[PDB]
Amino acid sequence: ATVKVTLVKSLNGRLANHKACVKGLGLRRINHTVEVQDTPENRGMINKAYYLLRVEG
Amino acid sequence: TRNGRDSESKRLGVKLFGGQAVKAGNILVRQRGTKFHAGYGVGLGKDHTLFAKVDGVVKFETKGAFGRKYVSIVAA
Amino acid sequence: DFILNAQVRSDLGKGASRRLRRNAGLVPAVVYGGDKEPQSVTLELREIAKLLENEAAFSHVIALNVGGAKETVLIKALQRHPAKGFVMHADFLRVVADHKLTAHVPLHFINEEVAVGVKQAGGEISHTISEVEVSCLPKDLPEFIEVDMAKVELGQIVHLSDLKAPKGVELVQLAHGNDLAVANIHASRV
Amino acid sequence: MLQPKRTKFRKQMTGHNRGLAHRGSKVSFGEYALKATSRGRLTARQIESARRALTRHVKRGGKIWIRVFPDKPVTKKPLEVRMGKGKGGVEYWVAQIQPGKVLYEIEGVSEELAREAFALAAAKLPLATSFVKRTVM
RNA sequence: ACCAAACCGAUGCAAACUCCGAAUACCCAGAAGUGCCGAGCAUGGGAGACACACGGCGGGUGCUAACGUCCGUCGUGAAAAGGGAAACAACCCAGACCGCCAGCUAAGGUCCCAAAGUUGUGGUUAAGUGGUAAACGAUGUGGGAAGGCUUAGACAGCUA
RNA sequence: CCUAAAGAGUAACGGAGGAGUACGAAGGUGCGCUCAGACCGGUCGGAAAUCGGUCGCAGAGUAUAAAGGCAAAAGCGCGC
RNA sequence: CAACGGAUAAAAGGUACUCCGGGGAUAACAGGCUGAUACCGCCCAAGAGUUCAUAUCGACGGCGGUGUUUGGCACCUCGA
RNA sequence: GCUUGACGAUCAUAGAGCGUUGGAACCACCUGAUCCCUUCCCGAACUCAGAAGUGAAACGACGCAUCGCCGAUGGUAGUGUGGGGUCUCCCCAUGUGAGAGUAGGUCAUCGUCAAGC
Ligand SMILES: [Mg+2]
Ligand SMILES: [Mg+2]
Ligand SMILES: [Mg+2]
Ligand SMILES: [Mg+2]
Ligand SMILES: [Mg+2]
Ligand SMILES: [Mg+2]
Ligand SMILES: [Mg+2]
Ligand SMILES: [Mg+2]
Ligand SMILES: [Mg+2]
Ligand SMILES: [Mg+2]
Ligand SMILES: [Mg+2]
Ligand SMILES: [Mg+2]
Ligand SMILES: [Mg+2]
Ligand SMILES: [Mg+2]
Ligand SMILES: [Mg+2]
Ligand SMILES: [Mg+2]
Ligand SMILES: [Mg+2]
Ligand SMILES: [Mg+2]
Ligand SMILES: [Mg+2]
Ligand SMILES: [Mg+2]
Ligand SMILES: [Mg+2]
Ligand SMILES: [Mg+2]
Ligand SMILES: [Mg+2]
Ligand SMILES: [Mg+2]
Ligand SMILES: [Mg+2]
Ligand SMILES: [Mg+2]
Ligand SMILES: [Mg+2]
Ligand SMILES: [Mg+2]
Ligand SMILES: [Mg+2]
Ligand SMILES: [Mg+2]
Ligand SMILES: [Mg+2]
Ligand SMILES: [Mg+2]
Ligand SMILES: [Mg+2]
Ligand SMILES: [Mg+2]
Ligand SMILES: [Mg+2]
Ligand SMILES: [Mg+2]
Ligand SMILES: [Mg+2]
Ligand SMILES: [Mg+2]
Ligand SMILES: [Mg+2]
Ligand SMILES: [Mg+2]
Ligand SMILES: [Mg+2]
Ligand SMILES: [Mg+2]
Ligand SMILES: [Mg+2]
Ligand SMILES: [Mg+2]
Ligand SMILES: [Mg+2]
Ligand SMILES: [Mg+2]
Ligand SMILES: [Mg+2]
Ligand SMILES: [Mg+2]
Ligand SMILES: [Mg+2]
Ligand SMILES: [Mg+2]
Ligand SMILES: [Mg+2]
Ligand SMILES: [Mg+2]
Ligand SMILES: [Mg+2]
Ligand SMILES: [Mg+2]
Ligand SMILES: [Mg+2]
Ligand SMILES: [Mg+2]
Ligand SMILES: [Mg+2]
Ligand SMILES: [Mg+2]
Ligand SMILES: [Mg+2]
Ligand SMILES: [Mg+2]
Ligand SMILES: [Mg+2]
Ligand SMILES: [Mg+2]
Ligand SMILES: [Mg+2]
Ligand SMILES: [Mg+2]
Ligand SMILES: [Mg+2]
Ligand SMILES: [Mg+2]
Ligand SMILES: [Mg+2]
C-alpha cells in the first residue's frame, strides 16, 4: 500500500521530463527517502525514472 | 546555381481537435481543397475553410459513400 | 524419418524470441489448421535443419510430437535469416483426413541426356520453375511431379498443361486459367 | 555500364543505407547465386567488370542473370573548387547493396564450375560475398 | 530468319511515387500527490544580448573528408570548481555557505612509482597479442554438429 | 513541391518549377448533361475529322506553374 | 520607388603618390586538421611472353600506407 | 408472418460475374401525339391522354467463391527511455509494435409508411 523510494543518482544532465518526475514524488537530494502511497499516478512516475531510484516496496 | 526560391508558409492544418469545445464562428480546419468536408453545424468558406455555426464539441467522423471525412459539432 | 519434437512455448514477443535463438539454440514455431486454436511451440535448431535437406521435406507429411502429444502437420511456410540463411521461424499446417491442402512440390526432370533437341539439333535445356502449387487430399499427396523431356524438339515449350499429375491432384495455377511455361529448349548462347 | 535510359530528376540526396534485404534475397531464376553478406554499393563499373570475368570463364552454354541495377546518381565537385556555389555534376551511377541481396545467378553448368566462376567475379567487387544454391523454401 | 506494341506470370528501386502505416511528439478534458511556499498570467521600472563552441541522435551540402559548413532536438562549456580519462574548455561521475588530523559511497581502480585483493573458482592466448589496420593468405590453437573411405585391408610411403 | 525528422514553424551561392496577369462573361441564379481512350461497321479524308454501336469509369477537364480538391460535380450547355 | 519596409526631387570612376581608425571577426607565406589529388605498396588474373598468367610485364576491377604535390577548411599570428 | 412501392440508417464480409425465377396487384416496357410541354433536327429524352399486349429488356428475389473485398495467431521490420560495441552500422534491459504473406470468411444487416396476401 505504501512504497519506499530512494534517489541514488544525480539529477544533473537529466531530461527536463525526468527531473519533473523525481520532483513530483518529493525527492530532493541523493539518498533521500520518502514513503508515498501506491497510486497508479505515483507508480507511473517511478517507472518513468526507474534508472535513478531504488524501490524498496 | 539557378534555384534559390521558395514561398512563405501558410500555417494550414487542424486548429481544434476532437472533443474540444467550440464557440460559433471559430475556425476549425485550414485547407487547400476539401480534405475535410463540413458536417453538422459546420460551414465552408470561400477558400475551403471550416468554421463553426453553432456551439458544442468537435466530432471528426468518416461516413457515407465516397469514404469522406466529416467535421461536425455535437452537443456538449 | 519425418519426426519432430517440440515443447510448448509460453513467453512471446521480440525480446523473448531473440533470447531463444541466442541462448537456448531453439526456434519458435506455430501449429495452426484443422478446427482448433493455434498453438505456439519451440523446437531445436539442429533438428529442424536436419530435416530440411531431404528432397521431400515440404512434400511429405510429418508427425510432430509436442510434449507428450502427437499430431499430423505439414510445413507451410519458413522464415530464414536473409544473410546467414539459417531458419528463424517455421509454421505448420495441421492435416485433416477430409480436407484439401495446398503444397509446393518439386519437379524432377528425367532422361535429359535422351532429349531429342540436344543430341540431334544441339540445343540446351532451361528449367523455368522447379516447383508447382498443388491441391489434393492428404491421402494422395505426391512427393514429386515427374516431368519427361525425352521427346522435345529444339525450340519447344513445355507448359503446365503438358505434364501429367497423379490421381486426384490439381495444378492450381492451371485451374485458374494461367498455364505458365515449365521448361524449354533453346539454341546455345553463342 | 548500366544506367537508366532516362530519369525524372537529374540529382539525388546522399541518403542512408540501413537494414537487411528481406526482398531480393532468394535464388529466383537460376540454380546457384552469389549473395551479399556485407553492405556497401556497387558502382556499375564493378558490375560490368565482374560480369565480363564470369561469362568468360564459362564460355560454353549456360545462362546468366544480373539482379542489381545501378539507378542512384552520384556527383563530384571538380578539383581546386571551393565549397558551395551549387551542387556538383553527375559522375557515375551506383546500386545500394544490403546484406543478403543476391547479385548474380547461373544455371546450365556444373555445380563446381559455378564456384570458380563466382570466385572470379567476387574478386572485382568491394564487399563480402557468399555462394548459395536454390531451396524449395 | 531481326524487332515486336499489348497482355500473362515471376522479380527489384524511388527526397520531389503511395493501396498501407507505427513508436514518439502535439492539442483537449478529468483526477491523487509533490512544488520552498511557490509554479502560471497581466500591467509597469531597469537591463544585458542579437561573433557562439563541442558531444549524442535525425538530415542537406562535401568525399556519409575535415576541430569543415548549414538546420532540428537534447547535454555540457560560455558563466562550473571537485574526482576519473597520463597531461587534456565541450567526455564519465558529481553541482563548492564556512570549519574538522571523523565515517559511507559514484566514475575509476587495488604488483612498485601511488591509497586499496601478488583475493577465490572454471577456461583462453605465446602474439609482449594486451599496448593502432584493410582486401586477402596460412597443416597456429580451443570448442561443436555432421560426413566420406576402412580387417572383402583404408591414408601415406616402398616394389612391378 | 522536396529538404522539414506523421500538429505549426525551420537554414544553405541546397534540388525543381511559376508570377508582376485574364474575364461584363470565363460573375449570380434556375433548369439539363457527362469525359479521355479502345474496338467493330460506314461516301471521297483514313493510324487520327463527321456518324452508329459496344466497353470504360475519370487514366479527361479545370484561363494560367505545382500541390491539395472536384457527383449537390468545383467539369459542359441554355434562358434570365 | 524590382536594391521590391521604399535614405534625396536630383549622382560615375582612379590611387603603385596615398592617409587614419580597426581585424588574425577575413586573404597572400609558413604551422595545424583532412587526404579528393599526388607518390609507394598489395589482391584477382584476360592477355603479351613461339607453347608457358606470375623470368619480365600485366588490361577490366578491388584494398591499403605516407604526409610528399595540387587542393579543401579558416584553428594561431595583421599594437609585424 | 409474406410480396410490391416510396424514404432512410451503413458504405464491398454489403461489390462484380454466372444460373434459375415474378406479373392477381405494383412497376417497367407499351399504344398515341388532339390537348399542356419538348427537341441547337427527331415524342429518343421531357410531357400529356390511355389500356389492347409482354414480363423480351430493365428491376426484385433465390443460388454458386470464379474475380474482388475482409482477414487471424505466430514471427519479422521500425521505435521512446537507460546502457554498450569492432560505432557510414548494430547489440542488451524494458515498453510498444506494423506492412506483406498464411489459416480462413463473405453472395449482407436494419427502421418508418402505403397497398395487398
Ligand atoms: Mg545548468
Ligand atoms: Mg549525462
Ligand atoms: Mg536552391
Ligand atoms: Mg526553386
Ligand atoms: Mg522555408
Ligand atoms: Mg461564402
Ligand atoms: Mg528491444
Ligand atoms: Mg548529405
Ligand atoms: Mg524495401
Ligand atoms: Mg516517402
Ligand atoms: Mg507529385
Ligand atoms: Mg523556503
Ligand atoms: Mg520587465
Ligand atoms: Mg547583428
Ligand atoms: Mg547570429
Ligand atoms: Mg548555431
Ligand atoms: Mg555562425
Ligand atoms: Mg557549433
Ligand atoms: Mg549529414
Ligand atoms: Mg548531425
Ligand atoms: Mg551525407
Ligand atoms: Mg565548427
Ligand atoms: Mg563532422
Ligand atoms: Mg547539434
Ligand atoms: Mg561571454
Ligand atoms: Mg569541470
Ligand atoms: Mg579535472
Ligand atoms: Mg588520452
Ligand atoms: Mg588530474
Ligand atoms: Mg568503504
Ligand atoms: Mg565499483
Ligand atoms: Mg600501495
Ligand atoms: Mg592469484
Ligand atoms: Mg606490448
Ligand atoms: Mg602492439
Ligand atoms: Mg515533427
Ligand atoms: Mg510539419
Ligand atoms: Mg535559422
Ligand atoms: Mg524567376
Ligand atoms: Mg469555372
Ligand atoms: Mg464516335
Ligand atoms: Mg450528380
Ligand atoms: Mg536599399
Ligand atoms: Mg528591403
Ligand atoms: Mg520581407
Ligand atoms: Mg571617390
Ligand atoms: Mg590599397
Ligand atoms: Mg594598382
Ligand atoms: Mg593603418
Ligand atoms: Mg589602426
Ligand atoms: Mg581565424
Ligand atoms: Mg563576415
Ligand atoms: Mg616562412
Ligand atoms: Mg594557410
Ligand atoms: Mg603558427
Ligand atoms: Mg599467349
Ligand atoms: Mg593518415
Ligand atoms: Mg607539412
Ligand atoms: Mg598543404
Ligand atoms: Mg567557423
Ligand atoms: Mg599577420
Ligand atoms: Mg608583440
Ligand atoms: Mg618581432
Ligand atoms: Mg413512352
Ligand atoms: Mg502480430
Ligand atoms: Mg505486434
Ligand atoms: Mg496484418
Residues 74-133 on D with a CB inside 8 Å of B are 85-87
Buried b (16+ CB within 10 A) or exposed e, B7-40: eeeeeeeebbeeeeebeeebebbbbeeeebbbbe
Describe the crossing of helices A16-23 and A40-48 by its angle, rounded to 10 degrees.
140
> Dihedral (C-alpha) D89, D92, D95, D99: value to the nearest 10 degrees?
-100
CA geometry: angle C163, C52, C113, nearest 5 deg: 40
How far does CA D114 lie from the centroid of its chain?
18
Short-list A26, A30, A10, C15, CA closest to A46 = A26
Beta strands in chain C (DSSP E): 3-8, 26-33, 39-44, 62-66, 69-80, 87-94, 101-110, 124-127, 131-136, 145-148, 157-158, 183-186
- In angstroms, rounded to a whole number, what is the distance separating the alpha carbons of residues C156 and C145? 20
Question: Which nucleotides of chain E have an atom under 7 angstroms from any protein CB?
Answer: 8-17, 25, 27-29, 31-36, 58-66, 68-69, 74-76, 92-95, 135-136, 145-146
Task: List the strands of the sheet with C124-127, edge to edge.
Answer: C124-127, C183-186, C157-158
Measure the CA–CA gap between C63 and C9, rounded to whole angstroms.
Answer: 18
Q: Among all chains, which residue has been given the C-alpha cell 533470447?
A: C19
A53 close to A17: Cβ distance less than 8 angstroms: no
Cβ atoms of C133 and C173 within 8 Å: the answer is yes
Give the integer Cα–Cα distance in Å for C141 and C75. Answer: 13
Alpha helices in A1-57 (DSSP H): 16-23, 40-48
DSSP per-residue codes, D31-77: SEEEEE-S-EEE-SSHHHHHHHHHHHHH-SS-EEEE-----EEEEEP
Show residues of chain B in contact with D86, CB under 8 Å: 1
User: In the sheet that B27-30 helps form, which strands lie side by side, from edge to edge?
Assistant: B13-14, B27-30, B50-52, B42-44
Cβ(D115)–Cβ(D104) under 8 Å? no
How would you classify the pairing of strands C3-8 and C62-66? Answer: parallel
d(CA C156, CA C117): 9
Q: Residue type at D97?
A: I
Experimental method used, please?
cryo-EM
Q: Which residues of D touch C77 (CB under 8 A)?
A: 137
Phi, psi of D112 (to 5 degrees): -75, -40
For residue D88, the chain B residue with the least C-alpha distance is B1
Q: Is C139 helix (H, G, I), strand (E, B) or coil?
A: helix
Using the CB atoms, write b or e for D81-113: b if 16+ within 10 Å: eeeeeeeeeeeebbbbbbbbbbbbbbbbbeeeb
The total of other beta-carbon atoms located within 10 Å of residue A30's CB is 12
Whether D19 sits with its Cβ under 7 A from any strand E atom: the answer reads no
Q: How many CA atoms lie within 13 A of C45 on its CB side?
A: 15
Residue B1 in contact with partner chain D when CB distance is under 8 A: yes
> Which nucleotide lies nearest residue D16, CA to C1'?
E64
Residues 6+ away with beta carbon under 8 Å from B75: B56, B57
CA angle C43, C45, C46 (to 5 degrees): 120
Query: Distance (Å) from CA A10 to C1' E83?
Result: 15
